[PDB]
Amino acid sequence: LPRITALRTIRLPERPKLIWVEVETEDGLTGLGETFRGAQAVEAVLHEQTAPAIIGRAAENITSISSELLNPYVGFGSSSAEVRAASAVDIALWDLAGQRAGVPLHVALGGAARDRVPVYATFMRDAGVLAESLVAEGYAAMKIWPFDDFASITPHHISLTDLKDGLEPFRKIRAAVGQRIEIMCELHSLWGTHAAARICNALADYGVLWVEDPIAKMDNIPAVADLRRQTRAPICGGENLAGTRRFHEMLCADAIDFVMLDLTWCGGLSEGRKIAALAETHARPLAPHXTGPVALMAGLHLALHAPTAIFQEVVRASWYADLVDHLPVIQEGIALAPTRPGLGTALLPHVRKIAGAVVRESGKPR
Amino acid sequence: LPRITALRTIRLPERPKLIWVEVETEDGLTGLGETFRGAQAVEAVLHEQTAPAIIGRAAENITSISSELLNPYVGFGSSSAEVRAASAVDIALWDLAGQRAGVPLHVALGGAARDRVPVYATCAGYDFDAGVLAESLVAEGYAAMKIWPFDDFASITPHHISLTDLKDGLEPFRKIRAAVGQRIEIMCELHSLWGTHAAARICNALADYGVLWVEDPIAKMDNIPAVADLRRQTRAPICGGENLAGTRRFHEMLCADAIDFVMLDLTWCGGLSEGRKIAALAETHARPLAPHXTGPVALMAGLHLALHAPTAIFQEVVRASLATWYADLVDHLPVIQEGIALAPTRPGLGTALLPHVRKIAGAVVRESGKPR
Amino acid sequence: LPRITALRTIRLPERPKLIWVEVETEDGLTGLGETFRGAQAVEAVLHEQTAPAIIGRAAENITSISSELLNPYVGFGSSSAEVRAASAVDIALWDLAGQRAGVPLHVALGGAARDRVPVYATFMRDAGVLAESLVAEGYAAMKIWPFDDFASITPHHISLTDLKDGLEPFRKIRAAVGQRIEIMCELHSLWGTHAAARICNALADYGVLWVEDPIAKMDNIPAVADLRRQTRAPICGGENLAGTRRFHEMLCADAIDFVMLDLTWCGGLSEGRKIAALAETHARPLAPHXTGPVALMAGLHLALHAPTAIFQEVVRASWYADLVDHLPVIQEGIALAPTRPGLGTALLPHVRKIAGAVVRESGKPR
Amino acid sequence: LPRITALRTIRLPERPKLIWVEVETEDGLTGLGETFRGAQAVEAVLHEQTAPAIIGRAAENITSISSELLNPYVGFGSSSAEVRAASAVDIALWDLAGQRAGVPLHVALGGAARDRVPVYATCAGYDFDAGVLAESLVAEGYAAMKIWPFDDFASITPHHISLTDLKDGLEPFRKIRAAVGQRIEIMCELHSLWGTHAAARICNALADYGVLWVEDPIAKMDNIPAVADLRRQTRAPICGGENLAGTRRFHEMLCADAIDFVMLDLTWCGGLSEGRKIAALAETHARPLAPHXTGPVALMAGLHLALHAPTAIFQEVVRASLATWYADLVDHLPVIQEGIALAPTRPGLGTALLPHVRKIAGAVVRESGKPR
Amino acid sequence: LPRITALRTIRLPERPKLIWVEVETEDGLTGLGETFRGAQAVEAVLHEQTAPAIIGRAAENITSISSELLNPYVGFGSSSAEVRAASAVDIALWDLAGQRAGVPLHVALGGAARDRVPVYATFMRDAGVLAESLVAEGYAAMKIWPFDDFASITPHHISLTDLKDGLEPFRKIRAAVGQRIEIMCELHSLWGTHAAARICNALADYGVLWVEDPIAKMDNIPAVADLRRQTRAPICGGENLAGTRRFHEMLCADAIDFVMLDLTWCGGLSEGRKIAALAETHARPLAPHXTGPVALMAGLHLALHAPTAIFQEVVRASWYADLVDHLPVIQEGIALAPTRPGLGTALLPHVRKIAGAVVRESGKPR
């Protein structure tokens, strides 16, 4: 029916890590997608290789386009420039399916599993004070990463004295708010097995909800599974992983307690929907990750569709409002279900005319 | 002492999939590397991401640089544009180590395991009846040949192959046997095109032709359980790894008993540092190895690895009897006589871009740091 | 290019466990290696079997020579007299590659992963006092072995009363310095499964960094893996093991938390480099072991190259200075990266003329 | 009571790989043992290390002594010079136990399981057309023969074997079959020379010759996963263990279903105490066993184990019809008639060095303790 | 050489569970063996089936006779009447080998691994008082079974109140003697999985050395392995098991921490020697079990030979002295190595003339 007509990318010097992709179909509509990191490489993928492959294709064949884009000869099965490009396009295509059908993107996926989802907020100074305001604002959980700096000394060991400093923020939170908020420890994929296990064991007293991405890197499923087995710590994994294969393997190895994924990194909404189905089959909980405003809106759509989603990561400090027309409605630490058709957000008309914006186009723009 | 001072990429409109990378050091030397596919993406990585990370670093910390470049926050554990870019730089760095020490690259790696390696030729000339081909390949002394006559059928569907399409794909195997019998090895390339049923059906049907290996049967070869089940059910000899990257994926293939032979492309796997680690994996498992061959630098890099690797048995090459475009771009190509590649004696990689390459019409030349 | 020209061994009656090997190449240079235990047997291997195999060979083919030497018809896959000889020669050959290239040995290996590495020091009286001086000197860790004597009663059981005596030094350390130093318990491969597990469990309160070589002997990978699983104690293994095969097996069984290796026992630098790559693939930390001055310098070179190295074992009490021209520079419990080409140490000219030195030569000495 | 008083080693310039060990006790008796390869290393171990450890100990604590000598701080779990030295002493100690009790060695071990064992002959005479050989071996009553025609090809490369080299290596198998059909068993020795692909290719190609076993296919046989995968994929009958040592490695081979037959050399595996433990492993797994045969002492030690071991089916021997150098060095050799070795009736090992051996020209004789 | 000439059995109405077997060889010597339970069935096996099989056989072929006797068409692989008979005969045959060679039975086996072995003694009233006398007498360990009676209510559950009563003796021991004696809890193969795990967990605070035979019955290797895994309790197993096969399976499953065996039940000394070698390969400790005086002497011989033996079970209350000429010398909780040839004990001449003794003979008695 309606075919893909043009592909446009936008980069802004103010945000060098971001890239926006707009896909035009012949019916006058335009879909929005986004991805994060290696923005020039992604731009190059989208124009050099993605546009020839997708322009002229019927836009309704989203899953089939995803399969092809997620399956390049090199760079498949990882969050590569190739796969970030594919993720961006897939979001724009689901956006378009929602527009065409006049329903929110999560409904186009197959429907809402919930009308709203708890959000968590994403400390070196006084984490207890921070915990107080977040509790007051109604946030059920908070995430902090106070061990990061220590990995620059060495990722394969952490001193007992450096460990103790890293634990202070958790002591401060529990002293200030007890059990009134959940804590997540983010390890950013920085550590070897021994350091990871040392941190995980030391966190026991603080009752964290999860330890996220403990091992460098999280494609190391045997290392994560052994850590989980030895320490019995709650492990979250997935943020920077892509494709059902690595997710399926983590889940089957019993390496993780929670599934995390970034819809702009993991392959996109079509892939993320498949990962949600894997999480459901294993009865494991899931939370989408959040970069730019589009990643956030795509994530929230998944968090409302996914049978086992429990949280959506939001930022508090994020300029998103300068780029797009709508953001999700968050009330007392709870994001509500969008009702607008499609993704429910679009770039503001001025974004192309921002100083030094790099705007590239393939095909025949409207 | 010697620090990295600049990073240059070259792209030529006639070879759109290729990219050459040149790495300059304070001591006046330039190292050459190369990679293949998504050349603009790779260029972008090299200049937006790699250049700021390596410029100012001592060039001699090859494996440390490689560890970093192979571990980006996104794109790790696969032949992503990130890892391809890393591989190109790693080749340039080993080139430099060879140069500084005045030794061929494979000696910088820790020594030759052999002074020559058997080759098989898959490509020739300027562009890139099986019985007649087999005859002349045998005449020229090649121990092995690789063909891929099933590829077209996968465009009908990658998940089934008819009995009729099967019979036709097997015709070239019949011809080779009828023409030369056991005088050459045959390798069936499947290019990661097929699902489990179609691959099993092809693998079983090839039994009677005594193929040396069936290469990359499964779409895609990160599907280790699918490959392991294939090898188990059919008992076919399986070669895997050409388009995979990093020690993790190879380590997993090998532990799962998924493959009989290890293949790798030195400009896709992470580079020579990683390839050296991948060769050690193979040696530990007692499995044989062959480097894959794209541009002249991949060829020379693969050769160095084939001479260094304890278990290397073959090196994929360009046909030595037929003049090739490689010869237009670089000063030196490996000596291949009678199905044998000889060990290079020159220091470093042993080949460099010809002076006119930077000036070719429509060449995109991008630079970071301070080119001399 | 330059070929191997002569092989010389030196034994000194003062140090009966040691042996030094010097390899001459035709370019005038000479490489130094060393190994420890069964020094006469090693001498016999080097002259009877190693010298015929290597004299006339190009010295640059280090890895290939290692493969042949590590692969004799009998005695492969263990720290045998055959494999200690091979290790000694391989160190001398890497020494020579560094000399030829005019770079430190770790650079010849492929480069530094770090410019310096923490060292640990290697108590029955008052361990707390010892802990004070080591902390003061800046040592991050210390290793003690107070259970050794009990294994001579029986290696398959340890009395609750003997256990308690063995634990005193750990109590004294923690009372005297708290968390200011790491402790490692060395079990010297002396114990059966039950005694090992008893010791490991009793050590929990003292928060040891690792328990090293708990089982007699550490080729017993199933016994070590079960101990690790049942007690969840941090296990170090490898000191007296050789070849990638036994290391690969330990790592795959999840038998260990830390990889230890002795470069004069394990097959040498070429083999040790491969073991470092295994450790890296598993994301496990590594520390080289230290015997004579050469073992120490070879170890330190590996500790600077190995992606996952965290410590280098040093002695405090070691006469090394009477034998060789250079030792590594240790500052405040931190060994710095050598800058001299090659191994960075050579026997002093007088060593051959020491009283009763046994000096044997094969080939044609300079 | 009777304590070990001295330890003697003998080396002869004509048999440079061999070493004999003699162990003296207070009661006037001397026990004989032997081992093979790295004879100077072994001599050194025996005198620098073993002698101080055993001298003064009661000779009757054979298994305790063995446990100690087999557990050196370095060199354990392999046929190291340490473990070879230990094995030689353990044989001498069981020799002594037999002597003191006035029983053949295998009876000291706990009894004969059989009064004779079938043998296969691999060596003859003074130096150490397959159809003609097979004919006379059959004529002489041997149930089995062992050949190793692939060894030379491994010096080209251990990681691949051409189809042509393959065809030639198989020729002796064709000849044996064409000459004698099913009248003799054939055993293919591979001597741990090959990588996984070359071994699989050889194992598969031997299917049609009905070989009893393919021996030590993999370089080296501590690579249990490689051997297990080989046996699984090809279903070939695999014999392993000749050059391995200690119960651990045998226990692991057996549990992994890597082998169909257990081979061991009593002068390399740890000795008779350890071999007895290794035979118990085999019995538990219901797997058959054969001792390997180097010098006359290894032969006699292997025979005793073959008569004792519950699952022993064969014993490798020297050809009984042809006079051998063994007869120059020792007083007694096993009775081998018609492909059968008879149980010795003499006490102890049942053979001792001839008086003139100590005096042979250029004999290196070293002693520790107090020789009488 | 000397052939088996006659087989004689003796039963005494005073001890209905026992049976003695004497084997005569043509050289005038006679060997003694023994077994326990189902004494009439064993008598019937020995005369109906064992005697025809062994009379006329050379006695020196002990291991071969054992193989045949342990391998009947029915009843192999268990401590059956068939296998108890075989065990009895095998002990008599090893006894004879020691006599012929003029050495103690453990020396005939291959030698002593130790010249002496610790013994442990085998409470509802006041276990603490009992603990005091045993400590005073020099016993390193004691074994009690206070949970037995509860299994007669039901073997598949134990009440929290019944559990508490069962634990009292352990509380009393630790209150009265602290860590001065080891405790073993004997469960007699009485319990299902849940009861066994409940008991095992509740015993943690009392620091028992082992829990022996927790599951009904100990051929249930998966049930024992899961118990060991879930509770991490030290498990002893083997007393009533026979043949290397069941032992090999327990050990490979990591079901046990200690190997126990009864030489009159397990197949005999030849079989027990093979089980000792299995224990050694796994690096697991071993203790022989003790029924009549012969079982005890046979056990002690094994405990002196077995590389990994740590204890020998002795009784304190045992009339043995009325039946045989020698018992082992126990000094301060330590049994010393026998020096007499053979088993080192023989029936007293009067035993055949005891009132109502049932004495049966096959072959031609002297």
State the smallest CA–CA distance between residue B91 and chain C in angstroms: 13
Phi, psi of B155 (to 5 degrees): -75, -15
Contact status of B277 with chain A (Cβ, < 8 Å): no
Contact status of E305 with chain D (Cβ, < 8 Å): yes
Note whether D306 and D291 are within 8 A (CB): yes
Closest residue in D to B239 (Cα) is: D197
Contact status of D73 with chain C (Cβ, < 8 Å): yes
- Nearest-angstrom CA–CA distance, E301 and E274: 14
Q: How many C-beta neighbours within 10 Å does residue B129 have?
A: 9
Note whether E333 and E308 are within 8 A (CB): no
Chain A hits for C207, Cβ within 8 Å: 160
* D-E Cβ pairs (cutoff 8 Å, strict): 78
Which residues pair with residue E10 across a beta bridge?
A: E20, E359
Partners for A (CB, 8 Å, 3+ pairs)?
A: B, C
Residues 33-62 of A with CB under 8 A from B: 37-45, 47-49
Q: Per this entry, what is the length of chain B?
A: 372
Range list of β-strands (E), chain D? 4-12, 15-25, 30-36, 116-123, 144-147, 185-189, 213-215, 238-240, 261-264, 289-291, 315-318, 336-337, 340-342, 364-369
Give the up-direction half-sphere exposure of residue A211: CA atoms within 13 A in the CB hemisphere: 30
State the smallest CA–CA distance between residue A157 and chain C in angstroms: 7
State the smallest CA–CA distance between residue B41 and chain C in angstroms: 28
DSSP state of D194: B
Note whether D71 and C219 are within 8 A (CB): no
Burial D127-140 (b: 16+ CB within 10 A, else e): eeebeebbbebbeb
Looking at the structure, give the CATH architecture of the domain made up of residues A103-342.
Answer: Alpha-Beta Barrel (3.20)
Looking at the structure, give the CATH architecture of the domain made up of residues B1-102+349-372.
Answer: 2-Layer Sandwich (3.30)
Closest partner CB to D273 (pick from E100, E102, E110)? E110
Contact status of B27 with chain C (Cβ, < 8 Å): no
Closest partner CB to C79 (pick from D38, D42, D75)? D75
- Nearest-angstrom CA–CA distance, C314 and C121: 6
Q: Per the CB < 8 Å rule, is C77 touching D222? A: yes
State the smallest CA–CA distance between residue E280 and chain C in angstroms: 9
Nearby residues of E31 by Cβ (< 8 Å), 6 or more positions away: E22, E23, E25, E59, E91, E92, E93, E94, E95, E96, E99, E342, E343
Q: Per the CB < 8 Å rule, is C274 touching B251? A: no
Contact status of E67 with chain D (Cβ, < 8 Å): yes
H or E element in which residue B264 lies: strand B261-264
DSSP codes joined into one string, D275-314: HHHHHHHHHHTT--EEE--SSHHHHHHHHHHHHH-TTB--
Contact status of B229 with chain D (Cβ, < 8 Å): no
- Nearest-angstrom CA–CA distance, A85 and A80: 8
State the smallest CA–CA distance between residue D279 and chain E in angstroms: 10
- DSSP helix/strand/coil, D168: helix
Q: Per the CB < 8 Å rule, is D44 touching C49? A: no
State the smallest CA–CA distance between residue A273 and chain B in angstroms: 20
For the four alpha carbons of C91, C94, C99 and C100, in that order, the dihedral sign comes to: positive
Q: Do chains E and A touch (3 or more CB pairs under 8 A)?
A: no
State the smallest CA–CA distance between residue C81 and chain D in angstroms: 6
Contact status of D156 with chain E (Cβ, < 8 Å): no
Q: Per the CB < 8 Å rule, is E61 touching D100? A: no
- Nearest-angstrom CA–CA distance, A94 and A109: 8
State the smallest CA–CA distance between residue A170 and chain C in angstroms: 19
Interface probe with C: pick from E116, E135, E211, E257, most Cβ of C within 10 Å:
E257
Residue type, E54: I
Contact status of D248 with chain C (Cβ, < 8 Å): yes
DSSP codes joined into one string, A53-113: HHTTSBTT-HHHHHHHHT--SSSTTS--HHHHHHHHHHHHHHHHHHHHHTSBHHHHHT--S
Residues 315-344 of A with CB under 8 A from B: none
Domain boundaries, chain A: 1-102+343-366, 103-342
CA distances, E44 to each of E11, E53, E127, E362 (Å)? 12, 14, 42, 11
Contact status of B183 with chain D (Cβ, < 8 Å): yes
Contact status of D192 with chain B (Cβ, < 8 Å): no
Find tokens 């050598």 and name the residue: C338
Note whether E21 and E32 are within 8 A (CB): yes
Q: Per the CB < 8 Å rule, is D41 touching C82? A: yes
Beta strands A358-363 and A4-12 are antiparallel
- Nearest-angstrom CA–CA distance, B200 and B227: 10
Q: Do chains C and B touch (3 or more CB pairs under 8 A)?
A: yes
Experimental method: X-ray
Closest partner CB to A216 (pick from C140, C232, C283)? C283
Q: In terms of Cα–Cα distance, which of A340, A323, A327 is closest to A18?
A: A323
Residue type, A203: L
Closest partner CB to A75 (pick from B49, B72, B81)? B81
| Domain covering E1-102+343-366 in this structure, CATH number | 3.30.390.10
Contact status of D277 with chain E (Cβ, < 8 Å): yes
Token code pair at residue D368: 């520790």
- Nearest-angstrom CA–CA distance, C273 and C278: 9
Q: Per the CB < 8 Å rule, is E112 touching D61? A: yes
> C-alpha angle B215/B221/B224, rounded to 5°?
110
DSSP state of C239: T
Q: Per the CB < 8 Å rule, is D284 touching E252? A: no
Residues 125-144 of B with CB under 8 A from A: none
Contact status of E180 with chain C (Cβ, < 8 Å): yes
Nearby residues of A153 by Cβ (< 8 Å), 6 or more positions away: A162
Q: Per the CB < 8 Å rule, is C161 touching E140? A: no
Partners for D (CB, 8 Å, 3+ pairs)?
A: B, C, E
- Nearest-angstrom CA–CA distance, E7 and E56: 11
Contact status of E212 with chain C (Cβ, < 8 Å): no
In terms of Cβ atoms closer than 10 Å to its own Cβ (0-12, 13-18, 19+), residue B156 is exposed
Q: Per the CB < 8 Å rule, is A37 touching B76? A: no
Interface probe with C: pick from E254, E258, E259, most Cβ of C within 10 Å:
E254
Find tokens 């051959």 and name the residue: C352
- Nearest-angstrom CA–CA distance, D152 and B260: 23
Closest partner CB to C310 (pick from A157, A197, A215)? A157
Residue type, B215: E
Whether a cis peptide bond, with omega within 30° of 0, leads into A217 is: yes
Contact status of A253 with chain B (Cβ, < 8 Å): no
Note whether E145 and E167 are within 8 A (CB): no
Chain B hits for A243, Cβ within 8 Å: 222
Topology of domain B103-348 in CATH is: TIM Barrel (3.20.20)
Residue type, B200: A
